[PDB]
Structures are given as structure tokens and as C-alpha cells.
Amino acid sequence: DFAEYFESLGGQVIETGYLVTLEKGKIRKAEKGEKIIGVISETAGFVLGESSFEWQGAVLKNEFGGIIYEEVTTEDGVKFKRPLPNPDFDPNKNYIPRSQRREWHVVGLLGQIAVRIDETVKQGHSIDAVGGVATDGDNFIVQEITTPYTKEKGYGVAIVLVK
Amino acid sequence: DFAEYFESLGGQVIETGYLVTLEKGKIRKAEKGEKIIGVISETAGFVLGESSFEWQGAVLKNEFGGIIYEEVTTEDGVKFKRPLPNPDFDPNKNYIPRSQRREWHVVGLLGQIAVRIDETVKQGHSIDAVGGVATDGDNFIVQEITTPYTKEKGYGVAIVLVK
Amino acid sequence: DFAEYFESLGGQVIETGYLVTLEKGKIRKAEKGEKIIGVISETAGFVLGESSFEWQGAVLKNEFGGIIYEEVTTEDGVKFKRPLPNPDFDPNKNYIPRSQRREWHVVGLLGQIAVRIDETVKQGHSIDAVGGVATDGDNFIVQEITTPYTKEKGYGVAIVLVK
Ligand SMILES: Nc1ncnc2c1ncn2[C@@H]1O[C@H](COP(=O)(O)OP(=O)(O)OP(=O)(O)O)[C@@H](O)[C@H]1O
Ligand SMILES: Nc1ncnc2c1ncn2[C@@H]1O[C@H](COP(=O)(O)OP(=O)(O)OP(=O)(O)O)[C@@H](O)[C@H]1O
Ligand SMILES: Nc1ncnc2c1ncn2[C@@H]1O[C@H](COP(=O)(O)OP(=O)(O)OP(=O)(O)O)[C@@H](O)[C@H]1O
Ligand SMILES: [Mg+2]
Ligand SMILES: [Mg+2]
Ligand SMILES: [Mg+2]
Numbered sequence: 339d340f341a342e343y344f345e346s347l348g349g350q351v352i353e354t355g356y357l358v359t360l361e362k363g364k365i366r367k368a369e370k371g372e373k374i375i376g377v378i379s380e381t382a383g384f385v386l387g388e389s390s391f392e393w394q395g396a397v398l399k400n401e402f403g404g405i406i407y408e409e410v411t412t413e414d415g416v417k418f419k420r421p422l423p424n425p426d427f428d429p430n431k432n433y434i435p436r437s438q439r440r441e442w443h444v445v446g447l448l449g450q451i452a453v454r455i456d457e458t459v460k461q462g463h464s465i466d467a468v469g470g471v472a473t474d475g476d477n478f479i480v481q482e483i484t485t486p487y488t489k490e491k492g493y494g495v496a497i498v499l500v501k
Numbered sequence: 502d503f504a505e506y507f508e509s510l511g512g513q514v515i516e517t518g519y520l521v522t523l524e525k526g527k528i529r530k531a532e533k534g535e536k537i538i539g540v541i542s543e544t545a546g547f548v549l550g551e552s553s554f555e556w557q558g559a560v561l562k563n564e565f566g567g568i569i570y571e572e573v574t575t576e577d578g579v580k581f582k583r584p585l586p587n588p589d590f591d592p593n594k595n596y597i598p599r600s601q602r603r604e605w606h607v608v609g610l611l612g613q614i615a616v617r618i619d620e621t622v623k624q625g626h627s628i629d630a631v632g633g634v635a636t637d638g639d640n641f642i643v644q645e646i647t648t649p650y651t652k653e654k655g656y657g658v659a660i661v662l663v664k
Numbered sequence: 665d666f667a668e669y670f671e672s673l674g675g676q677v678i679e680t681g682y683l684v685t686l687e688k689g690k691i692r693k694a695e696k697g698e699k700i701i702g703v704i705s706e707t708a709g710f711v712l713g714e715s716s717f718e719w720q721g722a723v724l725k726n727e728f729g730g731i732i733y734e735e736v737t738t739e740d741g742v743k744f745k746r747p748l749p750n751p752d753f754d755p756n757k758n759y760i761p762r763s764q765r766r767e768w769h770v771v772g773l774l775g776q777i778a779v780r781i782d783e784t785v786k787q788g789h790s791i792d793a794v795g796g797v798a799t800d801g802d803n804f805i806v807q808e809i810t811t812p813y814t815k816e817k818g819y820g821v822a823i824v825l826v827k
Contacts, residue, residue, distance in 0.1 A: 339549065340503060340611075340666060342775050354565045360825065362787060363808035373805060375825055380567030383549040386665065386709040386775055401811045401821045402680045402778040404706030447774055447827060448610055448666075449505050449549055452565040461525060479536060482526035485564045495564045499523065499538055501610060501664075501827075502712065503666060503774075517728045543730030546712040611773055612668050612712055615728040624688060642699060645689035648727045658727045662686065662701055664773060664827075 339449035339500065341379050343387030349441040354378045355454040355495060356470035358445060365443060367470030374467055374477055377453050377500060379446035390435045397421040448501055450481060455494045457487045465498060472496065502612035502663065504542050506550030512604040517541045518617040518658060519633035521608060528606060530633030537630055537640055540616050540663060542609035553598045560584040611664055613644060618657045620650045628661060635659065665775035665826065667705050669713030675767040680704045681780040681821060682796035684771060691769060693796030700793055700803055703779050703826060705772035716761045723747040774827055776807060781820045783813045791824060798822065 346352055347364035357377050359368040368374050398406045398421075407419035436442040458474040459465060461482055466475025471493055478498045487494035509515055510527035520540050522531040531537050561569045561584075570582035599605040621637040622628060624645055629638025634656055641661045650657035672678055673690035683703050685694040694700050724732045724747075733745035762768040784800040785791060787808055792801025797819055804824045813820035 340547075340774070354567065360788065360805055360807060363823070375805065375827065380563075380565055384547060384666075384710060400706075402706055404680065448503070462523065479523055479538065481523060497526070501538065503710075517730065543726075543728055547710060611666070625686065642686055642701065644686060660689070664701065 339377075339379050339382050339446035339451045341376070341382035341385040341444050341446040343385060343436050344443050344445045345441050346443055351440050352378050352443060352470070354380050355452055355493075357453060357465075357467040357472060358443075358470065359467075365445060368467040369470075370466055370468050372467070374500075376445040376447045377451045377498070379444050379451050381451065382444050382446055385444050388436050390437065393427070393431070393433050395424050396427055398424050446500060449499070450497050451500050452484065452495050453498045455480075455483065455487055455496045457489075457494075459483065459487070459494070459496055461496075472498070502540075502542050502545050502609035502614045504539070504545035504548040504607050504609040506548060506599050507606050507608045508604050509606055514603050515541050515606060515633070517543050518615055518656075520616060520628075520630040520635060521606075521633065522630075528608060531630040532633075533629055533631050535630070537663075539608040539610045540614045540661070542607050542614050544614065545607050545609055548607050551599050553600065556590070556594070556596050558587050559590055561587050609663060612662070613660050614663050615647065615658050616661045618643075618646065618650055618659045620652075620657075622646065622650070622657070622659055624659075635661070665703075665705050665708050665772035665777045667702070667708035667711040667770050667772040669711060669762050670769050670771045671767050672769055677766050678704050678769060678796070680706050681778055681819075683779060683791075683793040683798060684769075684796065685793075691771060694793040695796075696792055696794050698793070700826075702771040702773045703777045703824070705770050705777050707777065708770050708772055711770050714762050716763065719753070719757070719759050721750050722753055724750050772826060775825070776823050777826050778810065778821050779824045781806075781809065781813055781822045783815075783820075785809065785813070785820070785822055787822075798824070 344365045347366045357368040357374045358365045359372045400406050406422045408422050453472045455472040459472050464476050465472045481497040483496045485495040507528045510529045520531040520537045521528045522535045563569050569585045571585050616635045618635040622635050627639050628635045644660040646659045648658040670691045673692045683694040683700045684691045685698045726732050732748045734748050779798045781798040785798050790802050791798045807823040809822045811821040
């Protein structure tokens with residue numbers, strides 16, 4: 339799937355397959371009526387927001403998150419743009435990537451993503467969520483149930499085409 | 502466009518430009534009312550699901566399609582994770598990529614994608630599908646008709662912005 | 665965000681953060697009721713349509729934008745496909761990339777994108793657009809207001825999750 343890095347609300351840890359929603363700029367399990375933005379994913383071929391690499395703040399950024407470049411002038415003026423390092427930056431601090439912190443999740447936003455399902459979910463049918471687990475409903479299109487629902491497990495797994 | 506690999510229902514071959522839908526976990530031409538998931542595409546800059554590379558099953562995967570890693574222990578315990586090869590795997594078998602099998606299609610899910618249109622389709626207007634060909638309707642936004650509809654050809658081509 | 669290159673309608677220049685729509689196959693600021701296709705973006709990790717590289721026309725393309733390949737035959741017939749150069753192509757012309765022309769914009773279509781907001785926009789709430797600036801409404805989900813609305817500036821900045 340195509341995915342993005344998001345932060346869980348309580349700094350929780352939402353296991354893969356649960357449908358997720360936003361509350362105060364963070365992700366949690368999705369209940370009914372609530373809008374499903376995606377599914378926690380381990381299958382993502384393309385994911386945005388993994389500063390992996392350097393602290394997300396190493397360079398300053400404008401109001402729209404874009405790297406602020408200073409314009410440097412030289413030999414009667416060859417001009418080039420170079421990034422504008424943060425005042426708060428610390429090379430004394432040691433950086434841990436987002437794919438190693440626990441508050442950070444890979445959330446799949448588009449494509450075939452495997453989802454936790456209940457007994458209600460059917461092939462060729464849409465879905466809602468309660469407890470973050472899928473249940474027959476209004477959204478996306480269930481591709482195929484891949485590991486069928488059992489009461490002992492509490493869940494099954496279907497591929498849903500999230501768009 | 503941003504796209505994904507899908508399998509056609511009868512192991513068919515759906516030519517590029519046709520709008521497509523799902524039936525029992527596979528793709529076919531899209532008729533009316535049916536949900537359009539995408540368009541067969543030759544313009545995809547980013548496509549998921551092309552194992553290209555190795556048999557999709559070389560390594561085992563959990564219930565959510567994610568690579569199962571075994572935890573290996575060493576000199577009083579340096580620990581690292583290594584993939585867990587399939588029992589069914591055969592290095593005696595010779596592997597053909599998905600971009601060479603005929604049941605596998607590049608399906609464009611997001612972005613400007615060229616679509617087969619009829620006489621009804623107009624600029625700045627939405628679309629439906631019948632026969633997999635576009636027809637004036639409710640979905641997406643027709644960017645521009647690029648090769649206008651003729652009865653002799655049976656179709657025209659418009660760029661649609663699929664989202 | 666995941667983004668695409670688009671051309672502005674009057675060959676304008678739409679600054680980053682404005683919501684945008686289509687009119688006659690081109691982008692302009694989005695007003696009310698109109699469909700929001702995206703937001704001008706400087707944060708795009710993946711963007712399609714930047715020929716960067718060579719004139720978009722160097723090679724010929726079929727009716728669906730896909731590279732036409734000629735089939736070449738050799739020593740009793742090893743066959744390979746090679747691109748089919750345009751009649752109109754000029755190696756006497758010198759090529760300027762799309763990321764340097766002014767009519768070409770990076771439009772973010774999916775993911776967390778920073779957007780210009782008014783006084784009305786709230787956290788956890790949907791949006792519409794007037795003047796291309798966000799205003800409380802029906803679309804997407806406002807993640808967090810990052811630079812709060814002031815009358816003196818005329819706008820604030822919120823992260824919206826465009827899908
Ligand atoms: N001022 C700083 N200078 C350099 N590195 C920093 C700074 N603040 C935090 N870090 C790095 O970030 C990690 C822990 O802080 P944290 O990443 O939670 O801050 P953050 O700015 O909110 O980033 P994120 O949004 O990725 O959580 C450490 O790996 C540390 O190296
Ligand atoms: N058990 C196996 N071990 C190694 N390679 C295999 C195995 N089964 C199939 N293949 C490879 O897959 C190709 C044909 O089988 P096929 O790919 O249809 O199986 P599949 O597992 O359904 O994969 P896909 O979902 O890509 O079709 C051949 O290129 C062959 O090398
Ligand atoms: N016939 C041609 N042969 C080679 N290069 C060309 C040709 N026409 C335009 N260009 C290149 O394109 C740039 C200016 O023309 P322009 O790109 O607007 O044409 P275009 O085909 O509409 O491309 P785009 O859709 O990117 O605007 C120059 O950098 C020039 O090198
Ligand atoms: Mg943080
Ligand atoms: Mg198969
Ligand atoms: Mg042009």
C-alpha cells in the first residue's frame with residue numbers, strides 16, 4: 339500500500355490490521371460512524387514521514403513545512419540555496435529514527451491492505467469499524483477474506499482495497 | 502499515476518484505458534452502478550505488488566502479509582532478525598516476474614490517468630462506466646479529452662483525475 | 665504527501681498551501697461547492713509528472729500516454745523493443761525541467777498536507793474552500809492547526825489529511 343507515518347494518541351501501540359482514525363491530531367482505533375483514514379500496515383512499499391536519517395528539525399522549515407533556503411552570494415554573485423539549520427539543533431543529542439520509536443505507526447492510506455475482520459465481513463462487500471476491527475458496512479471494498487473469522491481468535495483477516 | 506498490481510478475473514487480458522472493478526477478489530471491466538477502483542495503466546511511476554525479483558512466497562509472511570522474521574542469538578547474544586523461508590519454496594523452479602504474466606495488470610488508483618471514453622464524456626465533467634468504457638456520470642473529474650470519440654473507433658481517450 | 669505535477673490555468677503562480685481545483689484541464693484556486701483535487705505542496709516525497717531529464721515528447725507515445733516501442737529483429741531474430749523518437753524532436757533545442765518553469769505546480773493529492781486556513785477552521789473538523797483558502801466544511805479531516813489564524817496575516821496554517 340501507499341502509507342504515511344502517524345503518531346498514536348496516547349503514545350500507545352496499535353498492532354497491524356486495525357483500522358484507525360484521528361483525534362486531536364493523532365491516531366487511535368476506529369469506532370462506528372467515525373471516519374477511517376487508514377490501517378496500520380507492514381506491507382507498505384512507499385511511506386512518507388520517516389525521518390530516518392536526521393532529526394526532523396535539523397533544518398528550519400517555513401509555515402508550510404517546506405525547507406527554508408538561504409540565498410548565498412559569491413564571486414560577483416553566483417547564487418545558490420542552502421538549508422537553514424535550527425537554533426535548537428543539537429549534534430550532542432543522538433538521533434533515533436521513527437521506525438524505532440513506538441508512538442510512530444506506518445498507516446496505509448491507499449491500496450490493498452490486510453485488515454482485522456469479524457464474523458460479519460463478506461467478500462465484495464463494504465466495511466465499517468468498531469474496536470478498530472472491521473465489520474460489514476459502507477466503506478472500501480473487501481477483496482478477499484484470507485484468514486476466516488473465529489470466535490476463539492476474536493478476529494479474521496481480509497484484504498480490503500482502501501482508497 | 503500511483504498504481505497497484507491486480508489479477509484479472511478470468512485470467513483475461515484487459516487492455517489499457519478501461520475502467521475496472523472487483524469481483525471475487527479480481528478485476529474485470531466496470532459496468533454501471535458498480536464501483537470503479539481504477540484504470541489499467543501504462544503511465545504508472547509508482548506501482549505496488551510487482552514481485553520482480555523473487556517468487557512472492559520465497560519468504561513466509563504472517564496473517565497480515567508482513568515478513569515473519571526469526572530472532573537469532575549469537576555471542577552471548579547479539580540479536581538480529583532474518584527472514585523465514587517457505588517450506589514450499591523451490592530453487593529448482595524458475596521464476597517469471599509479474600510484469601510478464603498475463604493475468605497481472607497495472608491498475609492506476611490515483612492521479613491523471615488516460616481513459617477510454619464514449620460520445621457522452623465532456624471536459625470538467627464526472628464519469629461512470631459501461632463495458633469498462635467511460636460515460637458521463639458521477640465519478641472523478643475529466644481533465645481533458647485528448648483523442649475525441651469516433652463511432653468508427655468505438656471510443657475516445659480522456660485524461661481523468663482518478664482519486 | 666503523494667503529489668502530481670499540474671499546469672495552472674492562466675500560467676499563473678499559485679503559492680503553496682492554497683487548495684486547488686480544475687477548470688478546462690488546468691488548476692486554479694478553489695471556491696465553494698467546487699471539487700478540491702489537492703493542495704500546492706512543498707512537502708511531497710513522491711511526485712509524478714516531472715520530466716526532468718528530457719522533453720516529455722522526446723519519445724512518441726500511444727493514445728494512452730504509454731511509450732510506443734518498435735520491435736527490432738536481428739540475427740535470425742533476437743527481438744527487443746526500443747523507444748520511437750518524435751518527428752518534432754529537436755536536439756538543437758535546450759531543455760528546461762518542469763521544476764523550473766512557473767506554470768507547473770506540485771499538487772499534493774494524498775496525505776498530510778499543510779493548508780491555508782481562516783478563522784472558521786477547527787481541529788478534528790472537515791473543510792471547504794473559498795479564495796483557495798480553507799474554511800469549515802465537508803471535506804478531509806483537519807489534523808492540527810499549526811499557525812493560528814490572524815486577521816493581520818489574513819490566514820493560518822493547518823495540517824489537513826487529504827485523501
Ligand atoms: N533539539 C534536538 N536536536 C537534535 N536531535 C533531537 C532534538 N530533539 C530531539 N532530537 C532527536 O529525536 C529523538 C527523540 O526526540 P523526538 O524525536 O520525540 O522529538 P521530535 O522533534 O518530536 O521528533 P518526532 O516528531 O520524530 O518525535 C532522539 O533520537 C533525538 O536524537
Ligand atoms: N513453490 C514455488 N517455489 C518457487 N517458485 C514458484 C513456486 N510456485 C510458483 N513459483 C513461481 O511463480 C511462477 C508461476 O507461478 P505463479 O507465480 O502463478 O504462483 P503464485 O504463487 O500465485 O504467484 P503470483 O501470485 O505472482 O501469480 C513461476 O515463475 C515460478 O517460478
Ligand atoms: N520540439 C521540441 N524538441 C525538444 N525540446 C522541446 C521541444 N519543444 C519544447 N521543448 C522543450 O520544452 C521547454 C519549453 O517548451 P515546453 O516545455 O513548454 O513544451 P511542452 O511540450 O508543452 O512541455 P511541458 O508540457 O513540459 O510544458 C524547453 O526546455 C525546450 O527544451
Ligand atoms: Mg514527537
Ligand atoms: Mg497467482
Ligand atoms: Mg506545456
